């Protein structure tokens, strides 16, 4: 009954804060934004990081990443954004990693909990991801001590 | 003596006294009252609820 075509285990998503996406032939895994926060918003002009891993489903040819755009600011790509034949392209260096980076210069404020659309183009497909903000291995920020009331 | 009216307004809310079953801890006691989603820290006393 539970081992049929509709199976609960097989359709499960990874227990991570990132988002999976299919950019035609490239698999976008663990797509998230790194942005330490202090107040209700991350004000415009602050520089945050966009981190993801691009997986080449095809094993014959190569692919390259171009023109990451979003309506939150301008995204700058630094490094060799080409993914190998049957390899990965790690963009960003997340916590727990002992150099392609995506630098986002904010134009409008962002906050953890909401979704912001990002556009990925490689050479054969343009998709929107709706990237979230993910705090990684950072410790819980201290809370001011409440008084007696 | 045992009989009690279920719908006697005894709970102060933002729009007057209300019956117990219509209210809860999330019912504002005045307009614009800030109610935080507090987490139980698991320790008795010494801030059992924090922001």
């Amino acid at each position: 009954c539970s081992a049929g075509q509709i199976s609960q285990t097989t359709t499960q998503e990874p227990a991570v804060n990132g988002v999976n996406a299919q950019a035609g032939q490239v698999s976008l895994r663990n797509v998230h934004l790194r942005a330490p926060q202090q107040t209700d918003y991350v004000e415009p002009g602050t520089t945050v990081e966009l981190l993801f891993v691009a997986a080449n489903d095809s094993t014959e040819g190569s692919n390259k990443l171009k023109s990451i755009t979003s309506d939150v600011g301008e995204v700058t790509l630094t490094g060799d954004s080409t993914v190998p034949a049957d390899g990965v392209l790690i963009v960003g260096e997340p916590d727990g990693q002992i150099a392609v980076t995506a630098e986002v210069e904010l134009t409008k404020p962002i906050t953890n909990g909401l979704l912001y659309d990002f556009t990925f183009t490689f050479e054969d497909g343009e998709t929107t991801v709706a990237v979230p903000i993910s705090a990684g291995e950072q410790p819980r920020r201290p809370v001011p001590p409440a008084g007696p009331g | 003596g045992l009989i009690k009216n279920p719908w006697k307004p005894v709970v102060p809310t933002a729009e007057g006294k209300k019956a117990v079953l219509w209210t809860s801890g999330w019912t504002p006691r005045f307009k614009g009252e800030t109610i935080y989603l507090a987490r139980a820290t698991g320790r008795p006393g010494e801030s059992p609820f924090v922001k």
Binding site: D40 | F30, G32, E33, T34
Partner: peptide, 25 residues
């Protein structure tokens, strides 16, 4: 029977505004 006050909606909804909080408890 089904509860009359429980129906699905197709409206997308908006992001809630930032809470301010009125004074004078």
């Amino acid at each position: 029977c089904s509860p009359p006050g429980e129906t699905a909606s197709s409206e997308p909804g908006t992001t809630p505004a930032i809470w301010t909080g009125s004074p004078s408890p």
